[PDB]
Design a protein around this ligand. Structure first.
Ligand SMILES: OC[C@H]1O[C@@H](O[C@H]2[C@H](O)[C@@H](O)[C@@H](O)O[C@@H]2CO)[C@H](O)[C@@H](O)[C@@H]1O
Ligand SMILES: OC[C@H]1O[C@@H](O[C@H]2[C@H](O)[C@@H](O)[C@@H](O)O[C@@H]2CO)[C@H](O)[C@@H](O)[C@@H]1O
Ligand SMILES: O=S([O-])[O-]
Ligand SMILES: [Cl-]
Ligand SMILES: [Cl-]
Ligand SMILES: [Cl-]
Lengths: 418, 418
């Protein structure tokens, strides 16, 4: 009759149902009830920070890897070094994954790695073929990326269901954390970054010459008509929905879309759509200073005001452990956080998934900072205003610089305090 | 083993679960399993129009009242006059609800009323009291509304959980259908409208002198600092989340927030929050040409490519009928569509809900037109750009007029399209 409450984000298309089937064996072996509540990504920051400040909430909460340091810095998370030792310690994890178990420079781990994700480009094989585009040259370089989009815009190809052209590229301009995650590769590729350590402190680098170069190149794809105006007002889920509906030739996303492509519309997938029958993946192109993609995922954290700490730690060890690592990655189409589970043969057979796995050497993420929640909110707000400059025909290098100088002022405030 | 597929939007905090409990009796009596799929509002237009164009989808779909004419005019909906006759016909419905059963001027009804919904202002009793605001004066007139917001801005009141001031008003500036529904009362209150019958056709009126007056007054609340810049990039979900979290003194919503306030976070509500303990409702203020609010909701439609039409009509008769009408309104915090069901004490004994029932006198909606889905997408896009003028310090009457001239040209295209 002993019970646990868990907060999760929508990691699969039937998230509560998938999470319940995942924990059913643990419920049987301990004779306990695990309750699950689903928080949309757009409101999860608001709801998790309120639970933290109020001292009331669940036993466990999913945390995006980029939030672990920001929640940890509030002093509301129970140490989980014991759980991670029981899962095989530092050596069981990719160094980049291990760094998401804590606030940078904290002694104690405060989250357990649950799943990994990184970004690549999904494209329509039938569209790039009709346009005469070589996917290998389109996704090899900025120049190539731009040339491929120009061909996709000039193409007379029409989706056989919609009977209408495809937008060359769709990217979300509003409301998602992905307004930051989708700009990051371009910034990094130009030799830029989101933040930089100097003058003793962390500050915004979104106004560095190289950051402006990468961000401007990204924004100018919309300026040139490769991204439709409508896309700049939309969020992640809508861009996913536009691709599934046969309206976009190319978009940036995570390994989950592969799982969706294999499942019917009734189960929140798109197996019956033209796009699922014509699905390609290519990595992010090399920029002038490097080849990068966003690498992230989600960890599980235990609030220090939980009344069932020993039982919730047993559940973290279960979810962080090999068997649940494999089953949840299968249900979600995410990559296991436990490095050993990448080698499970169920992940070796899928050709599109292999593209994601082998793209991981280009994966980069943000330092695990106390101000990071604020940085992401302000980044989403200010980058969405840069997309606005395009919708208005007002995008210039000076206007972008002025806007990123204001984003930088505000981000510097957030890195001092909450 | 007979099957039905039903598409619904997230009407309650656990939508699929609540919908399965609602249809359980019908499943038992008929030996059918009803499969439900949840479509977020932001992607429902995309997924419903793709089902229409492809001839592949569910048996039934939820349709927002403002979309019924638009989907009907695509030639894909079954007539349901038999179901509405069996539910008691034109007399069993509010005239405004009856008009949402069809495309304007069509012989045959193509949707069954499911639930009703109209807009009012939620406010924080504790905030208006600390600010010295008389709710009765604040929600009586535009001048009153503005005077109350000036007092809310000046207040040194801090939310007891956040330890921080409350924004006087939050409204979503992006990527919700509510960007239109939140503007419409201000437009209508100035004596404007969204569209106007102009010489044998329908056309945009967003660029009429009175429509600009109403919209300009609305936007200028944000110009004066009554709405934070942050709010202008956010969608309806985030604004609701911000109110629940104690960040907003006032916001416009539906009757569902009353149900949400009575349910804990773990079931998708906000009973733990200060805002649930300090909840007031007031009507939209009278504009200079009178008092108006947005009156809508959702109906249920049967695709004419369904293979299960006789059974799906029995399910429509069930969902539209007295018992299920009461149950779903209880679970969702919506008003029943069937007038007779308003008599249940769950509605008539609910003092916050009584403000929504009384607000129904002043309820207005859009004509039931062929291009209406297009009108809403384009309206949301262009109204999002009006909010942008504010964020940028570029709001002038000419700039707003130029923007609504472009919204009007685009909307005219969508209305004349065959
Ligand atoms: O910065 C927020 C976290 O985002 C996570 O990615 C989410 C994304 O935000 C959602 O929009 C959705 O599409 O799913 C993604 C995968 O769960 C990211 O994985 C985390 O590392 C970030 O902390
Ligand atoms: O315009 C589409 C329909 O909107 C309905 O209101 C929704 C709103 O769109 C959402 O943001 C959500 O919060 O809930 C509302 C109620 O379901 C409206 O009821 C319909 O009349 C519209 O057709
Ligand atoms: O901005 S254009 O779409 O009117
Ligand atoms: Cl960085
Ligand atoms: Cl939405
Ligand atoms: Cl109107």
């Amino acid at each position: 009759q002993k019970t646990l409450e868990v907060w999760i984000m929508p990691n699969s298309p039937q998230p509560a149902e998938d999470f319940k089937a995942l924990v059913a064996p643990f419920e049987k072996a301990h004779g306990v009830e695990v309750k699950v509540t689903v928080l949309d990504w757009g409101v999860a920051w608001t709801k998790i920070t309120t639970a933290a400040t109020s001292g009331v909430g669940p036993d466990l909460t999913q945390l995006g890897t980029t939030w672990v340091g920001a929640i940890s810095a509030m002093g509301v998370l129970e140490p989980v070094d014991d759980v991670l030792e029981a899962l095989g310690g530092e050596k069981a994890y990719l160094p980049a994954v291990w760094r998401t178990t804590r606030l940078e420079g904290a002694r104690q781990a405060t989250a357990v790695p649950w799943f990994s994700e990184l970004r690549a480009f999904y494209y329509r094989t039938d569209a790039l073929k009709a346009a005469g585009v070589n996917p290998a040259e389109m996704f090899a370089s900025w120049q190539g990326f731009e040339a491929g989009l120009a061909r996709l815009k000039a193409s007379s190809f029409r989706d056989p269901e919609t009977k209408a052209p495809l937008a060359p590229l769709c990217t979300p301009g509003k409301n998602s954390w992905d307004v930051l995650h989708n700009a990051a590769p371009w910034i990094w590729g130009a030799g830029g970054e989101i933040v930089r350590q100097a003058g003793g402190r962390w500050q915004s680098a979104l106004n560095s010459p190289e950051s402006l170069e990468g961000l401007y190149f990204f924004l100018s794809l919309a300026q040139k008509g490769y991204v439709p105006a409508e896309s700049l007002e939309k969020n992640t889920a809508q861009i996913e929905a536009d691709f599934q509906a046969g309206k976009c030739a190319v978009f940036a996303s995570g390994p989950w879309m592969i799982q969706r492509a294999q499942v019917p519309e009734a189960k929140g997938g798109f197996a019956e759509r033209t796009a699922a029958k014509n699905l390609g993946v290519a990595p992010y192109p090399a920029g002038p200073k490097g080849r990068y993609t966003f690498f992230g995922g989600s960890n599980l954290a235990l609030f220090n005001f939980s009344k069932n700490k020993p039982l919730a730690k047993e559940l973290l060890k279960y979810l962080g452990g090999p068997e649940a690592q494999v089953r949840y990655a299968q249900m979600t189409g995410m990559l296991p956080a436990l490095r050993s589970a990448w080698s499970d043969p169920s992940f070796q057979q899928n050709p599109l998934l292999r593209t994601f796995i082998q793209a991981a050497q280009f994966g980069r993420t943000y330092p695990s900072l106390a101000g990071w929640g604020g940085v992401e909110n302000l980044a989403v707000q200010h980058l969405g205003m840069a997309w606005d400059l395009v919708a208005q025909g007002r995008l210039t290098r000076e206007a972008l610089k002025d806007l990123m100088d204001k984003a930088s002022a505000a981000i510097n405030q957030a890195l001092r305090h909450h």
